[PDB]
Amino acid sequence: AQKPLSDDEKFLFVDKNFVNNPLAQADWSAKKLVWVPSEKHGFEAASIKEEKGDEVTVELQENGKKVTLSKDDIQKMNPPKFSKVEDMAELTCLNEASV
Amino acid sequence: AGKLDAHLVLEQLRCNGVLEGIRICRQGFPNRIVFQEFRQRYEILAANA
Amino acid sequence: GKFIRINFDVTGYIVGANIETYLLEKSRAIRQAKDERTFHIFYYLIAGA
Amino acid sequence: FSEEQTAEFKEAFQLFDRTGDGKILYSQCGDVMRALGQNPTNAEVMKVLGNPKSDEMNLKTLKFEQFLPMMQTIAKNKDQGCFEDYVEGLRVFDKEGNGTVMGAEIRHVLVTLGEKMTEEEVEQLVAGHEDSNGCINYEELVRMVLSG
Amino acid sequence: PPHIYAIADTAYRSMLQDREDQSILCTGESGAGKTENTKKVIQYLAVVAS
């Protein structure tokens, strides 16, 4: 509910004046959403399918693909409320991934 | 420009100590102030404490 | 390397400035590697002359 | 306002026009009130100006007869500052009960809180009250602007 | 928002506040912009404190 930003200010200022879309606020149910390896993205979005001890099955919320990795190669994802944050020391999840 | 290599930037954040550099900011207390300057600056907040 | 030092008075104004220069790789002044150049000024001179 | 002063007020108002129509730009009102020994805050001045807008504040003009009615309206007010509290506020920036504040911290506050002043404004004010260590004694600076 | 001109002012004040000299150290591998960011810090302080 804030002022409007000049095309320029959009280069040092975050664009926050939008609708409170519940798409993301609803997708949250896929709580199993985590971060994981990627020989091209360093890490990538995906969601847990089955926790099997030291290992866990997950499907890329990207390629729709289904791959299982160790229960220690996945990294907690930060809420949509953190997109494009100002001070990393804020996101409730510190990761080589989120950061 | 506009090109951003994931891992190249992932390592830098590794050998530079960024994450850790942040843990203590969250973990510890990076701000300190001596007993005098404190009862000095913010007394106006508690006039009767 | 370069370490610039700016000096302020009590009122908070700039008044001075020092510059501590370091390891000047002047080697290259004689032979530059592949796809590299010498100290700008050289070319500047050979042209801006 | 006794005609005695009202008669002089004119002398002051008149003593305020670069060209000559006999008009004080909606802007000048403030300083003219001040010059007449008035300390109206920035709001107390706009309130009696119909809250114009920057642009029109440099176009609109004033004539004593329409100005005088304001001079008074202000003249009679509810409050005013005073050493008592005035300094009580600055003494909050006194790093260590020394009784003095750094002419830089004072210079800050004054241009970052409330009716923000200008870099020059504060300069012209404190200027000459900072000691060797650029230290100003509010108690005094207070009185200065005041009793002055 | 985070900007270089900010680090510059944050220090330049901190100095005048707790009276205790300061340093702005630009790290980063070769090319990462160690220089530019310095030219700014001076650029800013050259007007903001002059």
* Cα(D141)–Cα(D120) distance, integer angstroms: 17
SS3 state at D3 = helix
Question: In the CATH scheme, what is the code of domain D1-79?
Answer: 1.10.238.10
Superfamily of domain D80-148 in the CATH hierarchy: EF-hand (1.10.238.10)
**How far, in whole angstroms, is CA C48 from its chain's centroid?**
19
**C8 contacts in E (CB within 8 Å)?**
15-16, 49
What is the CA A52 to chain-centroid distance, rounded? 23
CA atoms within 13 A on the CB side of B35: 0
Which strands form A66-70's sheet, in the order they lie side by side? A66-70, A55-60, A44-52, A33-36, A75-76
Q: How many CB atoms lie within 10 A of CB D141?
A: 21
D1-5's contacts with Cβ under 8 Å and 24+ in sequence apart are D1/D68, D1/D71, D1/D72, D1/D75
Q: D6-9: long-range contacts (C-beta < 8 A, 24 or more apart)?
A: D6/D68, D9/D36, D9/D64, D9/D68, D9/D71
Q: Do domains D1-79 and D80-148 have the same CATH topology?
A: yes
- One-letter amino acid at A32 equals K
SS3 A49: strand
CB A88 within 8 A of CB A99: yes
Half-sphere exposure in the Cβ direction for A29 (13 Å, CA): 4
E15/E8 Cα distance (integer angstroms): 11
Resolution in angstroms comes to: 20.0
Q: How long, in residues, is chain D?
A: 148
The residues with which A59 forms a beta bridge, in sequence order, are: A47, A66
Q: What type of residue is D98?
A: N
Q: What is the CB neighbour count within 10 angstroms for residue D142?
A: 20
Q: Say whether the D–B interface has 3 or more Cβ pairs within 8 Å.
A: yes
Phi, psi of C5 (to 5 degrees): -120, 120
Structural method? electron diffraction
Q: A-contacting residues of B 25-44, CB under 8 Å?
A: 25-26
Q: What is the CA radius of gyration of chain D?
A: 18
Residue C11 is classified by DSSP as S
Cβ atoms A74, A59 nearer than 8 A: no
Domain positions in chain D are 1-79, 80-148
Query: How many CA atoms are closer than 13 Å to the CA of E14, on its beta-carbon side?
Result: 11
Q: Please give the Cα distance from D122 to D127 (Å, whole number).
A: 8
Distance separating alpha carbons of residues A34 and A61, to the nearest angstrom? 9
Q: How far apart are CA A25 and CA A79, in angstroms?
A: 9
Number of other residues whose CB lies within 10 A of the CB of residue A86: 9
Shortest Cα–Cα distance, E19 to chain C (Å): 10
CB D136 within 8 A of CB D103: yes
CA dihedral D77, D81, D82, D86 (to 10 degrees): 180
CB C14 within 8 A of CB E50: yes
The half-sphere exposure of D76 on its side-chain side, counting CA atoms within 13 A, is 6
Q: Tokens 């360093």 sit at which residue? A: A42
Task: Select from C8, C9, C10 the residue whose CB has the most chain D CBs within 10 Å, as the one to mutate to test that interface.
Answer: C10
Q: What is the dihedral of CA A40, A41, A45, A48, to 10 degrees?
A: 50
Q: What is the DSSP letter of D127?
A: T
Integer Cα distance of D2 and D6 in angstroms: 6
Which residues are within 8 A (CB) of A78 and not within 5 positions of it... i.e. 6 or more apart? A91, A92, A93, A98
Helical spans, DSSP H, in D26-118: 29-35, 42-46, 64-75, 83-90, 105-109
CA A67 to chain CA mean position, Å: 18
Q: What are phi and psi of D27, to 5 degrees?
A: -70, -60
- Torsions phi, psi for B21 (to 5 deg): -55, -15
The Cα–Cα gap between A94 and A36 comes to 14
Tokens of E50: 């002059």
- The C-alpha atoms of residue A60 and residue A47 are separated, in whole angstroms, by 6
**Looking at chain E, which residue has its C-alpha nearest residue B8?**
E29
**Please, which chains are in contact with D (at least 3 CB pairs closer than 8 A)?**
B, C, E
* Annotated binding-site residue numbers of E: 28-35
Residue D93 class from Cβ within 10 Å (0-12 exposed, 13-18 middle, 19+ buried)?
middle
